[PDB]
Structure formats: structure tokens, C-alpha cells
């Protein structure tokens, strides 16, 4: 797997996933606050680190000592003697504003989640970082709070500097900040951060994002099939449980011609989006080229005219992935859909997908914050 | 919760004589399905009942239809199929 040099799991005011946390009480990280335990307990919610919170009456800044590199940074919030609705604030790092005018409650129950986790990918030069929480001065009621904080080392996994590799569906990633908004194991089960390949990313089942009743079928690899990452490829790109499970359209070819396998993802407007799609041919029937060929549409437009996973990989059960950039038409629904391409006469009319990762790309140099979700 | 409505003795010609062939045209087939099942939108839409599964069973039995054609190719909007 990947072993991160830094694994700072910080619980504020001090789990079900075998990870040890640390209170922020005597932390060198702390640089005043009014620690309080959570007012109400929801069985669906785990105590650590959701139950304990630290509240910032006035601006607060957190510091962590880190080597030069890119880090996952994940905030943990659970909306809850102050009143929960009146919490509006901003969170900043370096020249990057991670959050602004943010409400944990209006965000959380618009989405029918008890608690929220927010994920960022940021590059840090130097040995220190800027984590500042600021209660919005705009209304007076407004305060800030954080249940917990994770900072995790990370390779430069999601950047596409190489020349002409990425263009939008109609682009350069280097020392830009990304916020992860979706991470799905398509046709598979949830994957807890322990069960990730050492990067502690949560993978969620994709089915709640299917548009209608059109689920096709889920596929899993055969037992005598071995997922082999290509030689010279990092094996922590996604868990084997992501590439061993996939979703496809169904056993009937003419039926698969009449519908798209579709997913929809609500996104913030005004940004551009990195969409990493994850592939691995798990079917025993598909072993040669021109058997399964399909078109990928992103936001009702074509991102890939003809996707043949064998042409991408030359064999069964070998993972692969591809990055795209979607620039939405200016809080919004992002469409993903696949359809079979029958031009060139493939053996089967079908489509396939193993995993999805969508990140919000920081605009210019500046904001990664979007509007608060109207429920 | 056995279905309130009886689906055994209903007249499935609405579907069988329109949704056909080796190709199951999405528009024709979804029009036919709506025509047949919109008058029972109330009972089908209720999760507690045993009716929707019983209905699809009969639809697929009298039509010899492939496995999930209606779920897969019938979609309209976020709300569902209009039926008005």
C-alpha cells in the first residue's frame, strides 16, 4: 500500500475504523476556544470525533509541521450551548480559501447526512501550514467550529501536468487545490478509509446516484481472475475492491442500445471539475478488442467517443483510469452517462464503469468555496 | 402485503401489441407501459404493497420480455413518469 509519513488524526476536545485520534487540548498544533461535548447524540453518529467539538468565538489559526509535499486535509463537522443554525464561517489556507459562508446544518440536512466530512488536496511548501477558522463578521450571531481535523501525506496522485494530456470536454494541474466532492465504488460496496490502499479515502456505493431505475447489473471479478496493476504503476491508485466490481447495462444488446447508464452529481457552479474514471474489464467473456466498446458523455456531451478497455489495457482484470475536465455551463447537476458504440461492430453492445472520482478545481488562485445547499 | 389490485385478470394487450419485436423501442414501450400502469400509479407507488413486483411479473410473463427493460429504458424526469 502507501504509508504516509504523516498521519495527523486530530480530534477536537477529546474509532469505529481502527484509527487512533488525539485531542487538541495540549497540542502543539493549537496556537480563545471553548471546548464542548455534543449536545445531542445520534446513534448513527460515532463519538469520535463527532461528539467533541472546539468552538471559535473569534478567528483561530491552526498550525501543523509538515514536509514539503501534497496533503489530504479533511474537516469533520457535525451540526449541533449555541444554536446550530447560526454558525456561519470561513476556513482558509495559504492563498486558498477552503470554505466561506459555510453552514454545517444547512449543508448537512439538505443532503440527509447527520454529519459531514470535507476533503481537500493541497500542496505545501515549507514545514508549516495555515489552518484558520473565521466566524463570519457579516452577521453577528456567526461563530465557527470544527469537530476534528485530519492531515495526511499524499503522493502527487491527481495532477496532469504532462503536455496536452488533459483538455475540457469542448487544461493544466499543478499546485492547484482540489476538493473532493464524490468518490464512488461503481457496482461495489462502500470502502472505509482503513480498507483504502493506504490513503484513507472513503469510497461510497454509486447506486444512490443512478438517475432513474436504470441500474443495469453489477459485475464482480471471477475468483480465478486476478487484478493485476500494470508493471510500473502505483498500486494504491484505487483499492482492488474498486476494480473488481463494476456496473454494466445488461444481458440484452438491443435494450442496451435504447438507454444510457447514467449518474448525476450535484456540484457547485462557477468552477471546473476533474473527473477520474476507473476501469477494469472483469467479465470472463471480454478478453479481446472490439468486444465491449462504449461512448462516455460528461454533462450531456462527449468525453470519449469509443472506450475499449482492452485497447486501454490489452488484457482482462488489469486496472486503468482516465482524467477529464468538465466545465459546467455556469447548485448544479453534473451528468455522467455511457452508451454502447456499435460503429465498428463489436461483439457486445454494452458499457462499463468501476469507479468515479470528482474534484472541484480551485479557480485562478483563490476560492474553492461554493454556495450553501438550499434543501 | 399482497396487492390490493388483481393483476392476473388485467388485459395486457395495451403493452403486448405495441412493445414488441427484437428491438424494444424505448418510446413505444414506455408509452405502452404508462398507458397500462398509470391508472394504478397510486398502489404501485406505495412501497408497502406487494403489487409492483406482481405486476412486472405478469407483464414479463405475457410479453416474454427481457429482464429489466422498463426499469432501464423508461425515464422522464426526477419525479418519475408523468401519467397525466
Amino acid at each position: 500500500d502507501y504509508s504516509p509519513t504523516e498521519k495527523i488524526l486530530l480530534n477536537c476536545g477529546g474509532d469505529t475504523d481502527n484509527r487512533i485520534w488525539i485531542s487538541d487540548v495540549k497540542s502543539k498544533f493549537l496556537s480563545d476556544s471553548k471546548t464542548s461535548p455534543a449536545l445531542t447524540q445520534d446513534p448513527s453518529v460515532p463519538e469520535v470525533p463527532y461528539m467533541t467539538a472546539r468552538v471559535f468565538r473569534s478567528p483561530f489559526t491552526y498550525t501543523f509541521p509538515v514536509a514539503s509535499g501534497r496533503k489530504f486535509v479533511r474537516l469533520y463537522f457535525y451540526p449541533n450551548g449555541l444554536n446550530a443554525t447560526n454558525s456561519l464561517f470561513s476556513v482558509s489556507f495559504g492563498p486558498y480559501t477552503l470554505l466561506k459562508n459555510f453552514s454545517a446544518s444547512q449543508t448537512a440536512e439538505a443532503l440527509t447526512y447527520a454529519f459531514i466530512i470535507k476533503e481537500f488536496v493541497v500542496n505545501v511548501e515549507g514545514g508549516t501550514l495555515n489552518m484558520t477558522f473565521t466566524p463570519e463578521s457579516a452577521p453577528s450571531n456567526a461563530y465557527a467550529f470544527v469537530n476534528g481535523i485530519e492531515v495526511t501525506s499524499m503522493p502527487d496522485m491527481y495532477s496532469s501536468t504532462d503536455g496536452t494530456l488533459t483538455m475540457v470536454g469542448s487544461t493544466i494541474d499543478n499546485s492547484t487545490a482540489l476538493e473532493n466532492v464524490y468518490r464512488l465504488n461503481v457496482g461495489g460496496n462502500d470502502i472505509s478509509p482503513s480498507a483504502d490502499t493506504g490513503l484513507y479515502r472513503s469510497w461510497y456505493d454509486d447506486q444512490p446516484y443512478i438517475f432513474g431505475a436504470g441500474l443495469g447489473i453489477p459485475e464482480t471479478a471471477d475468483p480465478n481472475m486476478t487484478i493485476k496493476y500494470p508493471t510500473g504503476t502505483p498500486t494504491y491508485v484505487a483499492p482492488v475492491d474498486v476494480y473488481s466490481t463494476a456496473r454494466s447495462m445488461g444481458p440484452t444488446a438491443q435494450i442496451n442500445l435504447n438507454y444510457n447508464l447514467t449518474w448525476i452529481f450535484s456540484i457547485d457552479s462557477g468552477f471546473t471539475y476533474l473527473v477520474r474514471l476507473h476501469f477494469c474489464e472483469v467479465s470472463s467473456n471480454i478478453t479481446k478488442i472490439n468486444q465491449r466498446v462504449f461512448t462516455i458523455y460528461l454533462n450531456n456531451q462527449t468525453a470519449e467517443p469509443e472506450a475499449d478497455v482492452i485497447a486501454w489495457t490489452s488484457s482482462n482484470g488489469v486496472p486503468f483510469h482516465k482524467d477529464y475536465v468538465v466545465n459546467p455551463p455556469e447548485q448544479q447537476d453534473l451528468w455522467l452517462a455511457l452508451h454502447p458504440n456499435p460503429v465498428n461492430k463489436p461483439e457486445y453492445y454494452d458499457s462499463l464503469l468501476n469507479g468515479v472520482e470528482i474534484f472541484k478545481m480551485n479557480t485562478s488562485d483563490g476560492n474553492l468555496a461554493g454556495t450553501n445547499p438550499i434543501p | 402485503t399482497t396487492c390490493k389490485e388483481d393483476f392476473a385478470n388485467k388485459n395486457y394487450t395495451i403493452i403486448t401489441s405495441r412493445c414488441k419485436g427484437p428491438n424494444y423501442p424505448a418510446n413505444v414501450c414506455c408509452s405502452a407501459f404508462k398507458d397500462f400502469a398509470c391508472p394504478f400509479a397510486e398502489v404501485l407507488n406505495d412501497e408497502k404493497n406487494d403489487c409492483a413486483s406482481t405486476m412486472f411479473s405478469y407483464i414479463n410473463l405475457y410479453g416474454r420480455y427481457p429482464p429489466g427493460i422498463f426499469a432501464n429504458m423508461c425515464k422522464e424526469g426526477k419525479e418519475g413518469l408523468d401519467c397525466t
Binding site: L215, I217 | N45, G68, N72, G80, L81
Partner: peptide, 15 residues
């Protein structure tokens, strides 16, 4: 009124 996708999902493909 609508035919809900929950009802349509009763036509989901099995193994």
C-alpha cells in the same frame, strides 16, 4: 401523479 422510480426498481435485473 407519476409512476415513481421506486416502483420501476421492482423491475430491476436479478442474478
Amino acid at each position: 401523479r407519476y409512476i415513481s422510480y421506486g416502483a420501476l426498481r421492482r423491475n430491476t435485473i436479478p442474478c
